[PDB]
Amino acid sequence: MKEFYLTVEQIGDSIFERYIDSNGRERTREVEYKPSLFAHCPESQATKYFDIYGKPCTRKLFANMRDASQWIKRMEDIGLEALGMDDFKLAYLSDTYNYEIKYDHTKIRVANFDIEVTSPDGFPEPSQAKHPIDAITHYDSIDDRFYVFDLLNSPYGNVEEWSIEIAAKLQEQGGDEVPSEIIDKIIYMPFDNEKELLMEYLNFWQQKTPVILTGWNVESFAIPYVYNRIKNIFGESTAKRLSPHRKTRVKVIENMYGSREIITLFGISVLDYIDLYKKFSFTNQPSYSLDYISEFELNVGKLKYDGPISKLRESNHQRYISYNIIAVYRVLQIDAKRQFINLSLDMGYYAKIQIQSVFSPIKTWDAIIFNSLKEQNKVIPQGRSHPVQPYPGAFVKEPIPNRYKYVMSFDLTSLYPSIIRQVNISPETIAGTFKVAPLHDYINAVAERPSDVYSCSPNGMMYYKDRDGVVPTEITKVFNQRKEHKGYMLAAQRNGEIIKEALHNPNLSVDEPLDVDYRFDFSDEIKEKIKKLSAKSLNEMLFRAQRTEVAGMTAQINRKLLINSLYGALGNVWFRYYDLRNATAITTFGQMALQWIERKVNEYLNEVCGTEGEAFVLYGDTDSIYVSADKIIDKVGESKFRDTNHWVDFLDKFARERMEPAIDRGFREMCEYMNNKQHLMFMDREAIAGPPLGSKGIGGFWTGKKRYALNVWDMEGTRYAEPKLKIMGLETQKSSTPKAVQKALKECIRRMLQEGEESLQEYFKEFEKEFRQLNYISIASVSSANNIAKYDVGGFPGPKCPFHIRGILTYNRAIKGNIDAPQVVEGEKVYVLPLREGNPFGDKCIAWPSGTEITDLIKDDVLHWMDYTVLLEKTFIKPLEGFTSAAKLDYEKKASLFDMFDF
Template identity: 25%
Template sequence: MTIQNSIGTDTSTSTKTNNDALLSIKGRVLTRHATYRHGRLMLQYYIKTETGPALIELEQAEVICFCRQSDSELILGHFNSGIRIEPISLKNFKHQAVSCIYLKSTTVQKQLLRIANDAGIEIYEADIRAEQRYLIERFIALDAEFIVSADSSSAETPLSLTEVATFASASHSNDSLACYAAFKTRKADLAIPLSMISLDFECSPSGELYSVGLYGSQSALDNQSPLYKKVIMLGRPDFDADEINESDDSFEYIQWVDDEVALIHQLIHWFNEYDPDIIIGWAVVTFDLALLYRRCQYHRIPLLIGRGGTELTWKVEDKFRPETLSLPGRVVLDGIDWIKAAFYQFERYSLEHVSQHLLEEGKAIDHVENRGQEICHLFANDKKALAFYNLTDCRLVWDIFEKTQLLAFALERAKLTGLEFGRVGASVAAFNNLYLPHLHRSGYVAPARATSHGLESPGGYVMDSIPGFYKDVLVLDFKSLYPSIIRTFLIDPKGLIEAENQLKEHTVPGFLEAQFSRDNPILPKLIAQLAAQRELAKLNHDKPLSQAIKIIMNSLYGVLGSKGCVFHDAKLASSITMRGHQIMKQTKTWIEAEGYKVIYGDTDSTFVWLGQHHQIEDIAKLGNKLAKMVTDKWTKTCKEQYRIESYLELEFESHFKQFVMPTLRGSDAGSKKRYVGATEDKEGQIELTFKGMEQVRSDWSPVARRIQYRLYFLLFTKGDVKAYLQQELQDLDDGKLDDELIFRKRLKRHVEEYTAKSSPHVKAAIRLCQLTGNDKAGKRGTMIEYRMTLNGAQPIEATGEKIDYQYYVEKQIKPIAEPVLALVGEGFESLSSNQMMLI
């Protein structure tokens, strides 16, 4: 039995004859599902083709996992039916022969896992879902070609097929959704446009729906496509049609309905008519779709907004999260999740805050902080304004997606990882998708659990810094250091266990006594492919693809270092991080041998001070020369010492004309992961970079962060630091900075679950619940805004509390001012006596 047959093929009781015609259907897999029909497991793939949506079905006879061949009889002894076990030509990581277990259903699989756990039997790859395994074993990620049966007899001679399926059942009655039974599947590379809609609900404080806004395009990646806008509004127009001027199209995009039930039915009708592939929004899953679902439950209305008239459901009751949402045929992208996934960072992730930063535009409402009250007021008095507000929120989300290219990023991530289109996070699943099909073809199944042997790998290298105020500091970065280490030193789960049976001279040494085989490593080859794709993406200025590849490549070490990954082994992770330590230390030695001083190093970055008396006209040329020197030395070292090709590449990243490496607070020792640097742009304008400082930390007040930024700007431009601080302290005392004294912190748990009630934001949350009489203020996820007052932390709603200005001087301004004052020969006590009264 071949590896492909043992894993990739799905057995069936039916057959395909050569008299049946076949048709090729190519499409992008939007959602994937497993269901049961007449006791048989059916795989369903909702796809988007060039001619529209379609449902592909395959009859999958069994769920697949693996066990040792020596355990087969013991397992079979516990079952009367629903299971069969066959030996295959694969091994586990202990080089023991394994068998493939074929199970009738996931229910039988759960029974198997209980029995195996009690008997101490290892079961391999039981966590890979059938609908996912079918695709990844064929290297299919997003785009696929399905060979399906066709009524026409003009098709080419049929292939010899072993994969069989039945046509979709009569339950899929929507005529607009084509349904096919597939017999063979292979990967494809497609560029099929997808339609996208931005959705947003407005509601009462108790959750009754007022309106729903819909904004989008039939081709989400085509800027030329006409934009669509619609608001379904409860009630009747509170304005006359003749009052609307020619530029106001609100009379056209608002659709009026009599009540909430009619609004829901109209929205369901709209979904079946407009039929979007993708739904986007801001907290669209946790708020909008969860709210719609609850209102449908209240009115006992089936929420049939999936493709083919299917119902929106949740895999876990009352857990309204993206990973529990089931909406057949439609992909839901939450703007908050995806902007984080693309590594955009903001102090807050409210739509107002993010849109102001990215678009320089906010919500169409005067008092965003009291928007609940304003929405109720608009619904009662100005429905046209509410519709405009509703639609504006939809448009802001759309514009954010467009500006940040989030849809293109999500598509590229799905193509690269094989994860379901729209799934965020899931680094371990992405690793498995990439690694498992290659592992199977190499003759192995994945381990049952992570291996550690009581050892843990160290973190990235962080050098003890040399604190001070420097001029001309170069930053040299290793390009994708950890992926390059994996690729260079052949670090690979399969290679680790294969080297156990090989002579050391035929392996590459790692750390913690690890050795890695030189024979056909999987992970280094995957990284090589990703690196080549990224270089091509950069060449083509394809930012979404380049960013997606970078994130995936950098996540590979994190996965191997995580106990949540079955491939985790301290030998693997340590062979990466400890090699990184070695590389950084040796790089420092080589650079200092050239006469320069390395003042700091962090994971993959080396900070080089050129010295006080240097006279270099072209610093960039020097930076590139140093980087090439180190790169060449590593190439030579790897070849001579390890007989391997080096992919380590040091790059000249930046030149700080001025640079401050602070000391630890209250100590002369240098800090780590904290610095400030000043560069100049082409016009000679100064730009500041903060790392780990209060200015970039959201747990410090806005006033402290603003003052810190300005202090370093004045330091680097030779401004009057002391006079500036004196004025800021005076403004603080005069109450002019009160709006900048607000701390913002989100509750990670419900307030009653906190044991340390002394946390300021928890105290403020408890006080807010008391003030408002609303327990929702104390729920997990609530953003608490508070100031420090003479009565401690108080929510901003407690307007009668006196601000503790002394706290802000001592705990916020003084700690960030003292390091800068010290650099100009002053102390905080040197401020005028008028200011000292505050202290």
């Protein structure tokens, strides 16, 4: 097999590399790698190395890496550019793996672990590590085993051995319900003392050294705690055995309002799953506790126990250990679904970077571009210092707040990367500038043609057309990969809808789910078999289709993220190819493209309807347009349609056969106007929206920019079994909005769009009547909480104190003195409730850590003093009044002359 790296490090003048050799074996080597850097040289000097601008360079080979770094410094002192890859391990990988890396994941040791630490005096700080580690569960992907290290004797209590028999039993048998599928995979090791536990853990670690190290909060808690605890007990040298090269470094991670410490383990790639989740999941969660996320992702029950976690080991060690094991499994289950590890490996090996560098698109793209240029013997420029500067972005059209009955939307495929490719935007393709006219002049095609030679953007930039830049070349490769995975995603989505339809008529039979590949549209044979299946088999197939869709989503959306982040990197001061001329070229072209096509669509539809100056495009944001289809529907007549699906088909056909060709023609003209390299503005129909045929539903509404709701029947070629609400920006979509309120507001919207005013009025009346019965957590608001200290003046709100921070200070006074009470963590999230006047907390609101029950110290008082009236007005009534005013509807029935008769 072809060799591939696992980890790479620079330690002084040596590269330390762990790798899989040609025989499939894990090896480690130390290489005295001699790096090369570059200086510009005279034209008369014969060379094969040239910078990206075509200027000749001489290669300087250094005796070692320290010499190379010192040379860079001296070049700065002289005031001359030091060219080449300054990150020497990236150069090492480029030299050592000069081919497309094909990795075998089965050879890569992926470890995920979780530790338990009993602490009687609050949160056990990892920098201190003053409390015993009393449990470690460490899953190894190669062994497929959960290694459980269990401390039986502690200063906080001596306990009996954990029982695998009880662990396996149902909660109703007094067991822990450790999933049956992992029971036989548990290797249980009890220890009579913490020293022997940790020494064995280290010996185990040496034998089975993680390449990828993951878990939940492992980088912020588990790793630093383990390292510091071992350091405290045994000394530094023993703790450093967590590194296969015995090198570690305390790394200070800085943010806007403070800093924290992590431990860098040389020769390991830490991919903390919480951070993978935050980057790649495209959620914003009210809480990032493993419990909360596992419930959200897997629909698994909350892990229940009596009393505080500080007393769990002493009171129920059985449950304590089982829950430690389950926590490790839940991360594996989340990854089985989301597949962020697979994604990270894919990206890392493609770029030829340390796998952990996938968190940095700047590092990822620097490596991709370097490898690409190196292939042509080209030499990368030196990174430079730049001051942070604001620059303009997208255009968003101001909509007229209103109901909109029939809507067709259109969207440009991968806009910013498509602009990069079309215009040929790259550091080395800059041709010069032209004299800019107001943007409106380009939008209306009245400005003079920018260039007859170069490819242009309306920000004044011109680009070479003779050959693709490295940025267009490399962005295209990843775009093409994204397209493939999106194809799989949409097929699985369409397949899911086929199964949902079949579930209306399930067969009374006992059978199996079909063995199919959900990434491809079901054949006629498969569809016929599906119509004969039981509900049990169909539901299993639906679950599998949805899992395939999720797998495709991860793969496609994050390749989309990577390519959009290349645009983003052009506007980031730390990128080697940072250039606001290029960043603004992209965004300004986008603004023109959107408003150009708005004009073209308006012109086309005014022509086909026989009107003048009427606005068919009701809204647009960045790269999308929303087109009113009322007049199209009205031209055929609503009475001519058999059912909802009939007018959906009609609009589908109209968009594809009439509108899309018109849009294409408009963009081809724009391409010629800007003299671009390649026409790549592909705007396809996205959503078809409207009320159910014969209903009093309003179909859709806009309240303002980035705030709308649509009843969608077809999305990107997926015809839904049931209409799906597309709600953007509204309170239903905000993590700050209470859970039960999101639900209620969503039902209000559903009724507005599908059923009408009277239906909405009936639901509002009921929610207002019953909402005080809702669980307090479900009606609590949520907010991130920063700068708590800034607004804390003697435990009381300082000037301009934010409402949620006021809540935290109220909480802090109420739990004052309690060492065991849950602390609000700076930078994390809190639940927030309003309090009625005259309450014992002495203020108008209280806040507590999100994803948790408020401490029993104050729970009863919070419940008693919760201001339901304020809660309802702020979170529910005010947003609903916004929706209904925009939609021109009333959520409460107005008095009429009919009131009253009957006698």
